[PDB]
């Protein structure tokens, strides 16, 4: 194995086939991909987004960005709980920790508890992002990777298989990169993930792999050492 | 004014026109109805549901009913926050209290903070139901009515204008009731609301009016003393 | 064994023989009955009332019913802590969870900590009711039964051995029922328990047995499959 | 006025005429004494005991002192809430802060909030003692006096009007002291209050007056400068 | 006035003249500078660092960076409490909000409460950073600026009056910039602040002014519209 | 072994050789002494002070003693976290419980959890004192000893090997006592520890041993039954 512990960042869109909502069949498919990774023996922490449920203050009337972001963080917790149940259906031991403390619903985020969960071969799903507005779960992925000592952030990005010279769904001439420096991402103004998540990984020397989780073998390949997707380092 | 303080129970469906999501124009139209009631000078507490965002364990995989309920409670808080912004857009002073404590996002349910807010002519929106699974927001509406000393529960029901002999959406021949007793609702097995919400109001002699909030003038009518919808008492 | 997991509802009066207080010998006698049921191997959750310590707003001066209810909830936690010590005296593994969060004193109600404790053959005593005013512990017993997946609610009622046509303490001519339906309880206006607790169990098809815990063998009888008391179903 | 801000320590026994429980008439009488002090214009913080409800581990079976103390702290909060309602019945503005955080029921203890309450001419009742076992509310009285900057602790002791050379209810030859040093109290082994409360006041030079609150004029006299009871200094 | 609401980022070092500790005369001197800016009428939010009290994991034995960062977050709260007292002793109304919830000590970070405080012309001091390890006080300054709608982040740098081509206390030949872009800071590898704080401001278009707070008139100059220090925008 | 469970009170000064701060080699040296006592098999609970980081209100401007004490409580938690890391790096299983609840950083003080930890042969480090101002770490040592059922409080005094007739670093003619009573300490006006800590131990009959932890073999000596230091009993 190239990696013993990883942070897998997932789009909330992966929980539906139809753009919106939480759907059982899509959640099962996503669980099956995660179990494929779990079965390699890697230690697995996850950050889950909420694009399937909530886009932002465009949906509100007179809505601050902070308020819209809090709504989105609650949505990521909805997804976290749904994903945990799907993984438990496969018998994969799973815990959820949320960046907003909601005692009746899930454990709060507690570093020493997250570490013990990973050491006991459990998947830890992080809901709620970082708990702060003005981030996406991209930044929560970088932060939680650093907090659990993951060796790489695996960004399972919706509808792309890597980082491109441009948004490949707005420019068919876009070209995929094998490798990039953090600064190259910033200088070229690429919009594949929060620039704040880039700089957080930059400061720690934490590598990022952007890939297509629904390409069979891709996630297991990354874990086992294959070249897959785009490496930011 | 017949009533000085009312609890208004709203379906989460009122925030969308397309089945799913939170939508600006639907939320704004709902806020305008609430503003008409507020402008009468009545004191106004609201309980909001989550059916525009979450439909229960049918959407999960191997999901407890309790877990589905906690996800719904999170969804009601998302709706409460969106509704608050919409009302504040219109200049209506509004507070949100949640049955689950989420410090950054809203204040917790605290009985005499809620009493003080109503006394200060603010709308109090209660998110999170009662904080317990195995209720709907119907029972949360009954509970919160008793807690704030509301004089009646105004049940704004999605797509009906009162209580009928049968589900009017399955039975075109159903007949509307002008009045019912609590026991009559239970013995006829009508499915307009939680039977638990029925008996809570029954134990207290707290009346319920089931009505159509989008019939212009209905809500303000009830507040002023007109006969609108079905009275359960 | 007919039942694998039961919820046992206890009056706070069982902790005293003199109307008021918490008394060692009464608490110990109650703990011995609970130990007999535990020794059958059934999984056992308990909800405890507060009538030995608090009788409601009649004891206050200008006191809300909600405020009286919150005081009663505090009193149920006092009883839960006393009962736990008594059971631990007898070697019975016991946990206390409270509906109101009081960190130093007991763990908070958390649904799958409670599920894990029962799986580990510990008794879980729930203090604080549901955490909401306008319920009795009767409704808390119904709620907690549903939450832990109990198969029946065992209503140990103070000074009666079943449900009667009338209050047997006011009507010496009252007759005991072997069986009732939920609706029959409501329509006959019997005052054995919260009508809200009745309808909660009714909605779930959760049966209730009203019985005398101090009739030797009654509790263990019910657990083993004997006909004891009144079945509501 | 001799004093601008005082801490009044009250026995839980003052809430009953009959040894046990909370009784409306006794609570009103106690409220009327407190209002007499309030009407002088002094700033008034209160610590309330629980001897009317809970004595200790003698009432438990296999009961630790710590557990018995937690039960007693919950009882002081019951009394605090009852006393607040009685004072509110007289129109005296009153707040309750508890050393155990119980959000739905009362404010948590927060120093800056307690100070603002006193500055706004409200009575603050402290329930829960210090939140730590192994104290009595005597020690909570000394601690809360220091925390709010009270100039004296007024110990309204049950059934005595001062400090005596011996327990005056076990030795009719006991003599009352006008004045005592902290060390004199310790050296003579007097049992009128926690020795820990003595030393806490010793270290701060905080004077203590032990007196009979039901002697008409006594409490107002202390506040206005008269010699009443026993001074420990 | 050029700016109506600002976020002032301060080093923990400003609370000492001797490299380490909290010292009264330095804290008072810092409070007098803050009071001068308050006296312009600007709404003022502060983020305070910890360098006077804690450097990081090299002070620990086997200490991971996350643990060191939590220790520094505690230190920032220590400084916030000391700064609040100095400011209050000058009669400036001040509130402290902490990213880690410690009820007894200060109010939690709550965005709507912080907005009300600023509108009521109080200084809000933010302690605890963001509550997340791997985030710096520079990043907390950026975040809290966004959250309170400050128009600019004023980075009071220790012993430096702007951004330079190189660390000036390491290269006497370094040249100061009047103006830079966010990307210029990142590309030139400048170490004036956390790159994550840069990119957060970049994404919002929030301008940063790096300046020397102990150059008399500089802070007030920036507030009134003068050109002081270095503008990053 | 004379003692099976002890409470070890340590000064914050033991974490530095230079009067102030947290330093790795002093912290490691302190951890090696603690590990030597752990290796005897005794169950070991620790209370840690703050003097290496915070002296009190003379470091503040207009700073009341309560605020200074909360600042010191934060410092004791900083030290607890650093001590836990040094101990863990020696392979000693260690848990931290804090009197102020800071979820992200350490578990809250919970008596039943602390007992389980000691029974599972873990060191429990108590940070935050008691959570109350005006209580000292000496008083916290006494309290936490009572709460965990320690058989003795071991007061590791800074630069002193027992109790003396006078402050020895102020009177070279002072004479050491082998033994004293609680009352002798109070009557002689000795300043070795908080008088409130003395009286708390007096009331429980809990013995105190004042000793020099950096006299090699002394801590282990006390645990194995030797006569070391001064016994207060
Ligand atoms: N340079 C780029 N390379 C790859 N994807 C890009 C780039 N710029 C923008 N994108 C967009 O980023 C999207 C992923 O972002 P988002 O919709 O938020 O997915 P996720 O929810 O997985 O973060 C891709 O679908 C793509 O349209
Ligand atoms: N007897 C009845 N009278 C009226 N409506 C009924 C009755 N029985 C069932 N219903 C159905 O209940 C629906 C309201 O349920 P729900 O979707 O939960 O509304 P809400 O979301 O407002 O609570 C109505 O739209 C109607 O289809
Ligand atoms: N129909 C009935 N059958 C039995 N008991 C009844 C009935 N109606 C009222 N009761 C009264 O309800 C009491 C139980 O109420 P309560 O004191 O709350 O018991 P518990 O404390 O066990 O809930 C019985 O002692 C009885 O006096
Ligand atoms: N030396 C003493 N002087 C006065 N009262 C004493 C003394 N020693 C013991 N006491 C007892 O202390 C009692 C007050 O303590 P307690 O019953 O706890 O009252 P409270 O509940 O007000 O503290 C008095 O009723 C008295 O019996
Ligand atoms: N390009 C640069 N321009 C200005 N200062 C720099 C630069 N590179 C490094 N620094 C250093 O950054 C320091 C400011 O950071 P720091 O000491 O952490 O102050 P603060 O604690 O307020 O952030 C300056 O004292 C300076 O020595
Ligand atoms: N009678 C006494 N015997 C011993 N030490 C004393 C006495 N009186 C005062 N002290 C002082 O108390 C100090 C111990 O307290 P302190 O410095 O606070 O250590 P710690 O921080 O461990 O409590 C000793 O260093 C000593 O100088
Ligand atoms: O640290 C965080 C994480 C999330 N969010 C909000 O919650 C949403 C989570 O959705 P995200 O964009 O991360 O999901 P994805 O696009 O991958 O489905 C964000 O968009 C923000 O609105 C936030 O404010 N801070
Ligand atoms: O007290 C409550 C309130 C709500 N809920 C859950 O949250 C959902 C909220 O949706 P609801 O049916 O109340 O909304 P509506 O149908 O009125 O839009 C419920 O269905 C439950 O799953 C709950 O468990 N308890
Ligand atoms: O969910 C609950 C449970 C309890 N209580 C209050 O706490 C008291 C507990 O006494 P109960 O009647 O349940 O005890 P019992 O009569 O069984 O001894 C109730 O009366 C209410 O005042 C409440 O408000 N809600
Ligand atoms: O700081 C405190 C205050 C109270 N208690 C407990 O709660 C009871 C409160 O009753 P108290 O003796 O103070 O009341 P009084 O005798 O004045 O009625 C005590 O006896 C203890 O059991 C405690 O453990 N710590
Ligand atoms: O959001 C934050 C803010 C601060 N810190 C920690 O607390 C320290 C704050 O002191 P810093 O050196 O940033 O402040 P300065 O005094 O240098 O401005 C940081 O170094 C980190 O260790 C953190 O972990 N997260
Ligand atoms: O229960 C407690 C314990 C500690 N403290 C505060 O925290 C400091 C802890 O450091 P201390 O000087 O007591 O410890 P040392 O290092 O001297 O043993 C005290 O001085 C108080 O300011 C407090 O307020 N309450
Ligand atoms: Mg995204
Ligand atoms: Mg609906
Ligand atoms: Mg009863
Ligand atoms: Mg007492």
Numbering used by the authors:
A (entry chain A), B (entry chain C), C (entry chain C), D (entry chain A), E (entry chain B), F (entry chain B): 1 to 233
Task: Quote from the publication.
Nucleoside monophosphate (NMP) kinases are ubiquitous enzymes in the biosynthesis and regeneration of ribonucleoside and deoxyribonucleoside triphosphates. Prokaryotic UMPKs have no sequence similarity to other known NMP kinases but have significant sequence and structural similarity to amino acid kinases including aspartokinases and glutamate kinases. Generally, the activity of bacterial UMPKs is stimulated by GTP, whereas that of archaeal UMPKs is not. One hexamer comprises chains A, B and C, whereas the other two comprise chains D, E, F, G, H and I. The hexamer has the architecture of a trimer of dimers, which is common to other bacterial UMPKs.
We determined the crystal structure of UMP kinase of an extreme thermophile Thermus thermophilus HB8 in ADP-UDP–bound form at 2.6-Å resolution. The structure of the ADP-UDP complex is the first structure of bacterial UMP kinase with a phosphoryl group donor and an acceptor. The crystal belongs to space group I222 and contains nine ttUMPK molecules (chains A–I) per asymmetric unit. The subunit of ttUMPK has an α/β-fold with a eight-stranded β-sheet surrounded by eight α-helices and one 310 helix. In the determined structure, ADP is located between the αF-αG and β4-β5 loops, as is common among archaeal UMPK structures. The β-phosphate moiety interacts with the side chains of Lys9 (3.0 Å), Ser11 (2.9 Å) and Lys157 (2.7 Å), the main-chain amide of Asn158 (3.0Å) and a magnesium ion (2.5 Å). UDP is located among the β1-αA, β2-αC and β4-αE loops, as is common among other bacterial UMPK structures. The magnesium ion is coordinated by four oxygen atoms from the α- and β-phosphates of ADP as well as the β-phosphate of UDP and one water molecule (2.9 Å), and it may be coordinated by the side chain of Ser136 (3.4 Å). Furthermore, in the UDP-ADP form of ttUMPK, the corresponding loop is closer to the active site than the UDP form of ecUMPK (magenta). The Cα atom of Lys170 of ttUMPK, corresponding to Lys177 of ecUMPK, shifts 4.0 Å compared with the UDP-bound ecUMPK. This motion enables Asp167, Arg169 and Tyr164 to interact with the bound ADP.
